[PDB]
Write an enzyme that holds these catalytic residues in place. Structure first.
Site, PDB file in Angstrom:
ATOM      1  N   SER A 111      -1.216  -2.262   2.361  1.00 17.19           N
ATOM      2  CA  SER A 111      -0.388  -3.615   2.922  1.00 17.19           C
ATOM      3  C   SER A 111      -1.102  -3.954   4.321  1.00 17.19           C
ATOM      4  O   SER A 111      -2.148  -3.545   4.736  1.00 17.19           O
ATOM      5  CB  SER A 111       1.135  -3.761   3.149  1.00 17.19           C
ATOM      6  N   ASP A 315       0.420 -10.120  -5.927  1.00 16.56           N
ATOM      7  CA  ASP A 315       1.025  -8.961  -6.616  1.00 16.56           C
ATOM      8  C   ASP A 315       2.355  -8.883  -6.299  1.00 16.56           C
ATOM      9  O   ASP A 315       3.029  -7.947  -6.064  1.00 16.56           O
ATOM     10  CB  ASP A 315       0.272  -7.653  -5.903  1.00 16.56           C
ATOM     11  N   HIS A 356       2.895  -4.948  -5.372  1.00 11.81           N
ATOM     12  CA  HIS A 356       2.876  -4.472  -4.074  1.00 11.81           C
ATOM     13  C   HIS A 356       3.546  -3.246  -3.762  1.00 11.81           C
ATOM     14  O   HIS A 356       3.059  -2.479  -3.163  1.00 11.81           O
ATOM     15  CB  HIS A 356       3.458  -5.683  -2.964  1.00 11.81           C
TER      16      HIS A 356
END
Ligand SMILES: [Ca+2]
Ligand SMILES: [Zn+2]
Length: 392
Positions: A111, A315, A356
């Site tokens: 991320s 995602d 994610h």
């Protein structure tokens, strides 16, 4: 096979915490186990950084540096005066004092951690001209991070990184939904958000802003204060760096070092609607993302901002188009992987069908062999040549 002995260092984005936090529920591994421990057991020495989840990439980079070599976080006098926070922060023992002796590391970042890792490499190598001039002009001391000439980083791997921002921040109720997401990750660790736990549980590490959860205060109440605080309202925030314009600004100075390998992994968990052209969350996507974030990401267009159909695949949190490397406001180069990993360029390792949170095990996905993903990654990084030679 093995060409280098560089330890691996794990790094998180706008959510993340130390190995001892969340009652031992790991950011790296989540419900699936302990990724750092897996690598160590398989003979890949691996460490974990924990920095401010909501703090700017700059703050996080200064905290990373100091967490790595040891010492007291120095944010920079110019930077501290510019944003009105403390110059000095936490003090660390240093995970790897070997770094101050020519040693190197591989950074695996997830991320927003991928923005931070890039900026860390850029400061290490180039320092900060503005900080150097400020110390000169005002006669303040200056952190070695801002001098330039450090070469700690053999490689940077990014996974689901918003190199070009995420359009999630354009949601009109992004402020509430973003903290709801923090609550969802707490929920994943079986931690309630309406309880004033007396133990720390999730330290946001806002020492530069003088913010911390108070006795009697639950995370719900804590997050209400944070929303009104400079770590949410200022430009020196993850919130800003996460936005498309914010990311673009970061890209204008944070360049790929010619001395470092870059690997990018993208993630998607969506399908395209044939009539609308929009993207929709797949089955299995973490509940929160599926209800709250993915529908917006898969349908939000903005012509003047340059957000077009390419941006819709996602995602659950970040647009897949943003992940292969910085492009907006960037001179970095991105080359699709061809069996050969190239130095000083983004090697786009393609797009993986995981969301994610599944990619770090915080959300379950039995179809995703998470152990093998990271072991294959680790073996790939161990095979990197610290000094390649030019040849036919
Ligand atoms: Ca899932
Ligand atoms: Zn700052």
């Amino acid at each position: 096979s093995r060409a280098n002995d560089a330890p691996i260092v794990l790094l998180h984005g706008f959510t993340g915490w130390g190995r001892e936090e969340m009652f031992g529920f790991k950011y790296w591994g989540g419900v699936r186990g302990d990724i750092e421990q897996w690598l160590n057991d398989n003979g890949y020495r691996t460490y974990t950084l924990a920095v401010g989840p909501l703090s700017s990439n700059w703050d996080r980079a200064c905290e990373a540096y100091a967490q790595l070599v040891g010492g007291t976080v120095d944010y920079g006098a110019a930077h501290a005066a510019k944003h009105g926070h403390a110059r000095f922060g936490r003090t660390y023992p240093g995970l790897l004092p070997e770094l101050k002796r020519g040693g190197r590391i591989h950074i695996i970042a997830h991320s927003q951690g991928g923005q931070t890792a890039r900026m860390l490499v850029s400061l290490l190598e180039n320092g900060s001209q503005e900080e150097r001039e400020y110390a000169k002009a005002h006669n303040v001391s200056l952190s070695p991070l801002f001098e330039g000439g450090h070469h700690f980083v053999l490689s940077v791997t990014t996974i689901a990184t918003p190199h070009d921002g995420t359009t999630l921040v354009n949601m009109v109720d992004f402020t509430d939904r973003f903290f709801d997401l923090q609550k969802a990750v707490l929920k994943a660790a079986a931690v309630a958000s309406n309880v004033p736990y007396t133990s720390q549980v999730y330290d946001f590490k806002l020492d530069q802003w003088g913010l911390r959860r108070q006795p009697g205060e639950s995370f719900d109440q804590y997050f209400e204060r944070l929303k009104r605080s400079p770590v949410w309202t200022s430009t020196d925030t993850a919130r800003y760096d996460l936005s498309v314009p914010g990311a673009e600004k970061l890209n204008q100075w944070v360049k790929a070092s010619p001395n470092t390998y870059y690997l990018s992994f993208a993630t998607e968990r969506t399908y395209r609607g044939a009539l609308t052209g929009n993207y929709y969350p797949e089955l299995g996507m973490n509940a929160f993302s599926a209800v709250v974030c993915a529908p917006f990401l898969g349908s939000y267009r903005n012509a003047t901002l340059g957000i077009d159909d390419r941006w819709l695949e996602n995602d659950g949190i970040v647009n897949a188009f943003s992940m292969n490397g910085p492009k907006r406001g960037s001179t970095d180069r991105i080359v699709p992987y061809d069996g050969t990993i190239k130095k000083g360029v983004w090697n786009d390792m393609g797009t993986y069908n995981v969301d994610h949170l599944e990619v770090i095990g915080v959300d379950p996905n039995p179809l995703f062999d998470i152990r093998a993903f990271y072991l294959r990654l680790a073996e790939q990084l161990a095979s990197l040549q610290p000094h390649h030679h030019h040849h036919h």
